[PDB]
Design a protein around this ligand. Sequence first.
Ligand code: NA
Length: 129
Amino acid sequence: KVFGRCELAAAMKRHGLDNYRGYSLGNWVCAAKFESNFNTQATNRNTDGSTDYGILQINSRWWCNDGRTPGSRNLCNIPCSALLSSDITASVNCAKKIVSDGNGMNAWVAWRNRCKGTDVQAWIRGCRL
Ligand code: NA
């Protein structure tokens, strides 16, 4: 399931992301756009033994358990399966932890390299949330 941009924006806002730890809603929609093109089923399996999962491409080396990633670390305390739902509950809850347990949204390579320093509110203005 791909989300439409404004549908996702509304869902993210209704899960508390608009201005979360200083990141306006547009940051999160932009991150999703460039991490996964809004695809809840996106998966990127890596040579280090980790995999990036779901709409925010959260990486299994640190944040979720998929039963096979070296170190078996799970800082969001979720199965990586929960990051592949059209239910964004786990992706949102885990993203909040990531931003609190580190150097903010720099955890997301696509945010850092595509969304940072831009007018990220462009991604949500037309939704009028
Ligand atoms: Na893991």
